[PDB]
Amino acid sequence: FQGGMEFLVKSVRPETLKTATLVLAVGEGRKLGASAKAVDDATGGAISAVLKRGDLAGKVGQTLLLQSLPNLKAERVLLVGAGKERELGDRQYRKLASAVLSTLKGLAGADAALALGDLAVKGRGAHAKARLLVETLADGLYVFDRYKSQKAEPLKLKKLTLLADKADSAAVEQGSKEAQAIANGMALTRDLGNLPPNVCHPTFLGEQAKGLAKEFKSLKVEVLDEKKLRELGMGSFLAVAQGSDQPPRLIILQYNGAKKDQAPHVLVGKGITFDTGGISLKPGLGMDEMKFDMCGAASVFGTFRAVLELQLPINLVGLLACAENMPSGGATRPGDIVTTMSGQTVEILNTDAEGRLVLCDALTYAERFKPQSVIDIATLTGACIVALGSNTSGLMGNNEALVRQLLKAGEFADDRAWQLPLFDEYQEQLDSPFADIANIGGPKAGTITAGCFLSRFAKKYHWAHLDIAGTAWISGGKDKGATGRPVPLLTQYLLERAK
Amino acid sequence: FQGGMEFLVKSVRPETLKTATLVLAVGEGRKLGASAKAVDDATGGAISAVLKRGDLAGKVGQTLLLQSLPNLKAERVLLVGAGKERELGDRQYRKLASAVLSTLKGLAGADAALALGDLAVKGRGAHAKARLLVETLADGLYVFDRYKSQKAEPLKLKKLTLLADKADSAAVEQGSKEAQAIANGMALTRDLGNLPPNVCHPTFLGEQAKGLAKEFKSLKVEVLDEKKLRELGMGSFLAVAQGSDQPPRLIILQYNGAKKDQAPHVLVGKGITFDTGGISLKPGLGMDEMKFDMCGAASVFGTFRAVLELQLPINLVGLLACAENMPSGGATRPGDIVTTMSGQTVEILNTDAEGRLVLCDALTYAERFKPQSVIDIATLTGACIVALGSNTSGLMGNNEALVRQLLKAGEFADDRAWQLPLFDEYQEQLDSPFADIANIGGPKAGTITAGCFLSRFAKKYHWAHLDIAGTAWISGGKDKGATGRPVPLLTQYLLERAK
Amino acid sequence: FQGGMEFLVKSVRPETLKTATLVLAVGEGRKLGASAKAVDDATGGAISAVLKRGDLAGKVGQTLLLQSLPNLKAERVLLVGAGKERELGDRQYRKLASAVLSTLKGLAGADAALALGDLAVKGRGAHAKARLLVETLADGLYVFDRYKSQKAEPLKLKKLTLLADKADSAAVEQGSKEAQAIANGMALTRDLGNLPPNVCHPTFLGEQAKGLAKEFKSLKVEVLDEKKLRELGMGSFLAVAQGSDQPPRLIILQYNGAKKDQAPHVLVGKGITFDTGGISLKPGLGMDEMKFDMCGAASVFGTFRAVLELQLPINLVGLLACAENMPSGGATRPGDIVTTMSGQTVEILNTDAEGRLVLCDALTYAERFKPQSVIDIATLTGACIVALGSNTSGLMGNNEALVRQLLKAGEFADDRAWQLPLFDEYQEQLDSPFADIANIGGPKAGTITAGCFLSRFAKKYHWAHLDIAGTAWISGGKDKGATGRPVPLLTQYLLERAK
Ligand SMILES: CC(C)C[C@H](NC(=O)[C@@H](O)[C@H](N)Cc1ccccc1)C(=O)O
Ligand SMILES: CC(C)C[C@H](NC(=O)[C@@H](O)[C@H](N)Cc1ccccc1)C(=O)O
Numbered sequence A, B, C: 001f002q003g004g005m006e007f008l009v010k011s012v013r014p015e016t017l018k019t020a021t022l023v024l025a026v027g028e029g030r031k032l033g034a035s036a037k038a039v040d041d042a043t044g045g046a047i048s049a050v051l052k053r054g055d056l057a058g059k060v061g062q063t064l065l066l067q068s069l070p071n072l073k074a075e076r077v078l079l080v081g082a083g084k085e086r087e088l089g090d091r092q093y094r095k096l097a098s099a100v101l102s103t104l105k106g107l108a109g110a111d112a113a114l115a116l117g118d119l120a121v122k123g124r125g126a127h128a129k130a131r132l133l134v135e136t137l138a139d140g141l142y143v144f145d146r147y148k149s150q151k152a153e154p155l156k157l158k159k160l161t162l163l164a165d166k167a168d169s170a171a172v173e174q175g176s177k178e179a180q181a182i183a184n185g186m187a188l189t190r191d192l193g194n195l196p197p198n199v200c201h202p203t204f205l206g207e208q209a210k211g212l213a214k215e216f217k218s219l220k221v222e223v224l225d226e227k228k229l230r231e232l233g234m235g236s237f238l239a240v241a242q243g244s245d246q247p248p249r250l251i252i253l254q255y256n257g258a259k260k261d262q263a264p265h266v267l268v269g270k271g272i273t274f275d276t277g278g279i280s281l282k283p284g285l286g287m288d289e290m291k292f293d294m295c296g297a298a299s300v301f302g303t304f305r306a307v308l309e310l311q312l313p314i315n316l317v318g319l320l321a322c323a324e325n326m327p328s329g330g331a332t333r334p335g336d337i338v339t340t341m342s343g344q345t346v347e348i349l350n351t352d353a354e355g356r357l358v359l360c361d362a363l364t365y366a367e368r369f370k371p372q373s374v375i376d377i378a379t380l381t382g383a384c385i386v387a388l389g390s391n392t393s394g395l396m397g398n399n400e401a402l403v404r405q406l407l408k409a410g411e412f413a414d415d416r417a418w419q420l421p422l423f424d425e426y427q428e429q430l431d432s433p434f435a436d437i438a439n440i441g442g443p444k445a446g447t448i449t450a451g452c453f454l455s456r457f458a459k460k461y462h463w464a465h466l467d468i469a470g471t472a473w474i475s476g477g478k479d480k481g482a483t484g485r486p487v488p489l490l491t492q493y494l495l496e497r498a499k
């Protein structure tokens, strides 16, 4: 998705700014903040006169669109309700921004100017509000129509101006710049997740990574095929892949924005391009949504895309463990025992617990980078949706400082996670009479035991695990599709590590 | 269960103490701590001579039983392995204690003396180790054989002596005293949970509370019947009860150990004496375990029993909301709408979400006590077992300080909980087109939305919610039955509030 | 729901009419019909000037709201898109009307004037368009908030004026009058369906019928209790009811608008106020929607309400067979054999096929009225949703002319049905080795065999059967609730019979 929206920050007077649409906030009770009052005064009270008619109650997201008003250079004035509180929460601020965007998308105006600086958002200053506002606007422009014969009508809206006080403009510009890069990374993530699995297979993802290296000269890419995986001894990764006609790929992304002495941060992504379950076959209902089972790997693409645009001074490694999980006459069977890269043997009791089998070999591979943090991202357990639903990612890890850094990043990004414990008592659920580890722990604590399985391959470094099974996509309705989460959390984490 | 084990703390020399069995720890490699070395020296090296034969590797919990040794007044010497580490974890310490207890139960000795003061446990001093050791021993003596025609053979073991240094003896005695009271409360809790539902119905629990008031003059009890519930307007509590022939009971326990000016702590317990699911009937498999669905209420009994024995200087209120959930020609139907005590209307979409319907009316009732904390305890969601398994209780609440106090208490007691978030975004899952609240939130985030439902009745005070669906009992095997959790967490919380 | 919207038909010029909001249609390409052109000319081209800006593409249902325009007496002008075709279909016309209504509901205007006479709708003249438009508007005003503590904000909109040419005004007024009565009947139907089953039980429906007789002196009501049903020998009706604490009711409505020599039309409605399935218990998931299992009976209420308002010259009888289907220690069992009123014995193989057991006794009862048509209406089979979905009712009968009359009525009302065959070959699926009829026919042709069962009680008159299991309510989402169908079909059928 080409994006291309221009976001500008300006400190000019709203009431003399030439624009197709000037956007103003209105509180409940027809109450007017400083910017809206100044525009109203410029029109001679035309805005307060309309509001007195009572059509706009001022609840968050309600709108009233006015045409040409006296003495303004704005062709239209859009009023958006901001509720009755002095301070909006994050959800309300996003809802207001989305309501503005939805109106602007349907207009023929080529630009709009947002005079929303008077809004207050709990716990967020100028930079933090700009981060949320611009990310919501930019990501709200995302369109996936690759396989529609009838394409979307192109938007007339090509430019958005954020009006800010001179004292705040530098922070608003910084927030906008960071949010745009995050949303650009989100768009790549969403594209890859949304692509169907007959197109987006492991080989395709390897070519996508080579494409990203053509676009960004600071990125180096290596794509390893099944011969190299066998050379490296990644027996559990290969066990997942062997049932499919599609070969697996381990994609290595490397970006060196800091000095050679700075240890890298490693992102490990689950790239299961389609998960049938294998011989442990899934039910048919909703199985199409397993095209999103590579969204962990896609979020590594997207985080790299944001970091490469921002040119952050950090050293970053991405490992995308990509395979397709299929039934066949040569597929892995329940009860197979394999030897992982690490040398630990694994009894594969259920071939639908396959993401942890490609991830564990990638976690062993990650040791060579002498990393200062390793984060894996995976659409890993249905149990995580039972535990935390569709709006909060599960988070687990072996280092409290890293876990806290990721939680803090998710809070700032409003792309939240929540820690679940890896108490040693859970580990015995993975005991196998036949191997070093079983790949399932039974019906109890499923998100945790999956994290426990992964932890056995991450003991040599500081590691965390994001289970995005609930947050990586929307299952149904008009908005079915990949979300791009957790690119905002991950990019925020890296922004903080880059300071 | 009458208990009756005598726990004594003494500071005498182990090698001259008259006892049926002297218990000593042995490390891996036949290594001997200070107490064991002193006993060995007293026997002229008889213990190190035996250990040299190699039968006891010294792994945690392994045992070797010796008879009469030279120059000792101990009739027997029990060696128990303590592993290879300088410091045991909590799990290892419990395992060692249980191994000792299992051996002693099978001997004809009338007492045993534990010379285990040399063991180190990570993060635990004398008092904290005594708390864990004595609770494990005392609770390990629990027996439920009420309906067995062949009763357990009575134990010969009637006395346990803990040997401690003079400088540690006061802390060991304090820990022992507190642990015994906790285990006594646990025994009452376990008895009530284990009793079958044709015996332990709401009326029976009301009589149990009157029995507890006869035993403890500091306790006052009121038992409210269905006429009083209707007078109070508890429409959702009554909706759960109406399908059953057994009438409901709201049991009120009050203990005033502090001055009248000290606001009380309120414990609210789910007392569903059997949960068939109602019209939303449960499957038959394992449904017998729903006799444990009153374990939340039973843990309020048990916590009171511990507090009453210890005479803690706190003001404590217990509210046990007791009903039986049955199908019948007059039972509540899916789609019924009722008015709670609070005035909020609830659409009962699923009659198997019944615990929250008796709890919410009890939470409204709790307002009259002007409490400084309100904790409800409930075997509330199967989703909590998916999220946190059988060993960690789910914890939710509306006050961060209270939540942290409960987590800290569970850590100290080794009866741990884990917080799940009540983010406002989850609340919309309870939206009903027909009432103020629906009683279910769907397949996503089931433990959280149950907590969200309860939170709507707890806004007037500091409140937390413990979902013990996984921790309140053991489902199968030789040890099937109620655990008594979370009496240790709750009593520890109150001990800390009483300082 | 009190309704109360005033619908007026006027033939005045739109451009001089005083109104809070004047509504005009705009075609794709900014094309203007006669009324819209006349208003535009009155403003000096202000409307075409705005449209030239391009914000309103003119797709069906899109809107653009203007404030005060030059030389108009309308405070606001609402433009609504009408698409690119010369003629709208029924669905498009409804969508346009709903879009207008949704906008008007959010404005503070006390009235609105619709200048939509220039719209063409395929196959519909002035009267038929008014029927669809006014029914959509009036039914779109329905609100059910009985058990919400926070009530809906009252609408400012209290009056809608339909502008029509003088030559069309009589037909528009007639269509409006009929549509308002249909929507008023729909509102009663929807209220009863939406009421929860602990409130809306058979006794309650009997009192509702007495209430309707207080409002309409032309209506006579008799309510028969279980003693009378037993006297009449309705063994299958009583078999359904016996498991519940709620007694059954047979409600008889009689309206004599024609001469005594005119044979009556009889409407028979399934009034199962809640369907648990009985001993053949339903699964828990979605079972709350069985509060809509009395929507057949509710549609008889609603059709009577429309006929009574219109004072149609017909003789009409309503039979509401009302019971609650519950499990209990006295409930009917699978394998029970009962004797129906007709004397035919029925083997009740499945207690969840209960609607046909109350209907068949009511169909025998209907014989006494010497009817010229008998129509039963029932939320009868899940198979009907498999066959015809949620938008088309299933229709079956023993008389081709009656079936065709009902199909024609559903087409005119845009509340369509579709015939399924009652070929004699299907009848053998109801053979029982033990009784005259089994109450189920197995997994094949479930909607048809239910109709076949009913047909065995309707041989003495011209009879049809509407299976509204899919059309009587909306299952989920924001708009969950009763629809009021098939009141429009039934009232249209009676309007045609009254000519
Ligand atoms: C076999 C089980 C122990 C593990 C299993 N996990 C998987 O199948 C993963 O590979 C799935 N990719 C997890 C998943 C399933 C449905 C929706 C979102 C995410 C699961 O059922 O969660
Ligand atoms: C209907 C659902 C929203 C809620 C439902 N909860 C219940 O049935 C509770 O009343 C049960 N007492 C919860 C439970 C079930 C099995 C094992 C332990 C605990 C559940 O399935 O968890």
Ligand SMILES: CC(C)C[C@H](NC(=O)[C@@H](O)[C@H](N)Cc1ccccc1)C(=O)O
Residues within 6 Å of the ligand: C275, C293, C350, C352, C353, C354, C355, C379, C380, C381, C382, C383, C440, C441, C446, C469, C470
């Ligand atoms: C037992 C079967 C032969 C008949 C059975 N019918 C019923 O249960 C009716 O009483 C139901 N009221 C039919 C129904 C079910 C679900 C949604 C809408 C309507 C059915 O399953 O359709």
Ligand SMILES: [Mn+2]
Residues within 6 Å of the ligand: A275, A277, A351, A352, A353, A354, A355
């Ligand atoms: Mn899988």
Ligand SMILES: [Mn+2]
Residues within 6 Å of the ligand: A272, A275, A293, A352, A354, A355, A379, A380
């Ligand atoms: Mn998977």
Ligand SMILES: [Mn+2]
Residues within 6 Å of the ligand: B275, B277, B351, B352, B353, B354, B355
């Ligand atoms: Mn239940």
Ligand SMILES: [Mn+2]
Residues within 6 Å of the ligand: B272, B275, B293, B352, B354, B355, B379, B380
């Ligand atoms: Mn329960």
Ligand SMILES: [Mn+2]
Residues within 6 Å of the ligand: C275, C277, C351, C352, C353, C354, C355
């Ligand atoms: Mn049924």
Ligand SMILES: [Mn+2]
Residues within 6 Å of the ligand: C272, C275, C293, C352, C354, C355, C379, C380
């Ligand atoms: Mn039914």
